[PDB]
Design a protein around this ligand. Sequence first.
Ligand SMILES: [N+]
Length: 372
Amino acid sequence: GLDSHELARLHELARHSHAVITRHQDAGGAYPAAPTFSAYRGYAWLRDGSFTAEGISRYGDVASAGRFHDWVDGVLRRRRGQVDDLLAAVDRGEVPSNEGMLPTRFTFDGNDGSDPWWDFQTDGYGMWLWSVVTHAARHGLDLERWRAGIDVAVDYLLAFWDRPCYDWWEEHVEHRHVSTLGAIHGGLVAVGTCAALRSAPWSAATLQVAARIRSLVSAEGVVDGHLVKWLGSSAVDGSLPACVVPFGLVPPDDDVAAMTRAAVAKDLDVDGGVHRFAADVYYGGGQWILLSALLGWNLAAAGDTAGALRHLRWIADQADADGDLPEQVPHHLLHPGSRAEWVARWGTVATPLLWSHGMYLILADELGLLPP
Ligand SMILES: [N+]
């Protein structure tokens, strides 16, 4: 496995991962995506924050993870009226526009950071349900602390799970993305199987809608035995392993899990560095730390420890002088011609990306390698 040279380097990157996340956590509890990247700074995403929170919870910083869940909960409780209004609009048969939906970017004080017409996404609400239930289970916490916020997210996802929206990468609003459906599934199954939430009025509805999501993925989201990027597509996306671990469309030992890991490795993994999708031109379509961590996590869960370690080593090799993990690296580019214009518009690649550090902590924990 690992010699004391490798173990010391991986332990130190875990410690630094914890420090980077907790140093940049907003005073109100939000995890920012990237404190220094021009286009992300000043905003929080539930997607980034939920995976970040899960790495922190595994690391054992109950206080930091708790303040994130407090922040999300309070932000969601403040949208109780908005969600109620959207649902009433549905009940009058007046399907609300993407422009009226709950936002993707949040300011640290819980306001819309962006206009959902341009970035409408439902995945982050599902990831938060997954994250908060997993945290409470891990540390024996009372979910009543966050329940009113959970109620808002559940009511919203039960109404809007089957709507087309932008993917994790803010593309293709007209499509229904299998890793978005997967994130919602993971959230709904988490709350629907949670004994502390057995008396919630939506308890049964969450498992019935999760079953609906799996029906839709079985009908339109599987080709040649593997998951696909969006319903009705043939291609894969680096996000798809999240549909196995942790969101649970299929278990790790399922043939569709195996074939999805194989298809992602073949189409998108170059030397351990995983690309988002074949057409990606963002910074030339580089190799994403969080996707190499996600594939590694899935390989560990399937009993492929070696394949998991190889992806972990690849990630650790992308750490800069200070131990910071970038969003992505250009060792292989899908569209090298596109990179300069991105560096010109937005500057050098987001570093650190807190989500890179969160995913590092999860994969290190899955391999039993966090400092003792
Ligand atoms: N696991």
